[PDB]
């Protein structure tokens, strides 16, 4: 989780 | 690994069942960070944590910023073809 994450 | 085309079947009432991270603004591809249980990606198989998403339904996701990619991915419906690679 190094960068922003988005659930799709 | 090899570049892979992977089928995913998504009804309108459900999501893709993946989380993504990365993107052009971070200098890395759109990467799958999570596969969610029982949702389309999990049910169909073929997609894995760490896979880079190069394209979806022929639409290029290379060099795409995180938000751009979210918008494109979130618009795909029905029989969806992912082009991914584990590199």
Curated annotation (Swiss-Prot), chain B:
Tissues in which the protein is found: Ubiquitously expressed.
Subunit relationships: Homooligomer. Interacts with FZD5. Interacts with FZD8. Interacts with GRID2 and BECN1. Interacts with CSPG5. Interacts with CLCN3. Interacts with STX6. Interacts with CFTR. Interacts with ASIC3. Interacts with GOLGA3. Interacts with NLGN1. Interacts with RHOQ. Interacts with MARCHF2; the interaction leads to CFTR ubiquitination and degradation. Interacts with ADRB1. May interact with CACNG2. Interacts with CCDC62. (Microbial infection) Interacts with C.rodentium and E.coli (strain Sakai) NleG8.
Superkingdom as given in the UniProt entry: Eukaryota
Comment, domains: The PDZ domain mediates interactions with FZD5, FZD8, ASIC3, GRID2, CLCN3. Also mediates interaction with CFTR and ADRB1. The coiled-coil region probably mediates association to membranes, targeting to the Golgi, and interactions with GOLGA3, and STX6. May also mediate interaction with RHOQ.
Disease per record: A chromosomal aberration involving GOPC is found in a glioblastoma multiforme sample. An intra-chromosomal deletion del(6)(q21q21) is responsible for the formation of GOPC-ROS1 chimeric protein which has a constitutive receptor tyrosine kinase activity.
Residue stretches making up the PDZ domain: 5-87
Gene name of this polypeptide: GOPC
Name used for this protein in its record: Golgi-associated PDZ and coiled-coil motif-containing protein
Cell compartment(s), UniProt: Cytoplasm; Golgi apparatus membrane; Golgi apparatus, trans-Golgi network membrane; Synapse
TM helices/strands, residue ranges: none
Organism the protein comes from: Homo sapiens (Human)
Biological role stated in the UniProt entry: Plays a role in intracellular protein trafficking and degradation. May regulate CFTR chloride currents and acid-induced ASIC3 currents by modulating cell surface expression of both channels. May also regulate the intracellular trafficking of the ADR1B receptor. May play a role in autophagy. Together with MARCHF2 mediates the ubiquitination and lysosomal degradation of CFTR. Overexpression results in CFTR intracellular retention and lysosomaldegradation in the lysosomes.
Range covered out of full length: 284 to 370 of 462
């Amino acid at each position: 989780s190094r960068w922003p994450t988005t659930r799709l | 690994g090899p570049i892979r085309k992977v089928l995913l079947l998504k009804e309108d009432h459900e999501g893709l069942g993946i989380s993504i991270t990365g993107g052009k603004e971070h200098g890395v591809p759109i990467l799958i960070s999570e596969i969610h249980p029982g949702q389309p990606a999990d049910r169909c198989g073929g997609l894995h944590v760490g896979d880079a998403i190069l394209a979806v339904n022929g639409v290029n996701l290379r060099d795409t910023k995180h938000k751009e990619a979210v918008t494109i991915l979130s618009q795909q419906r029905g029989e969806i073809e992912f082009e991914v690679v584990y590199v």
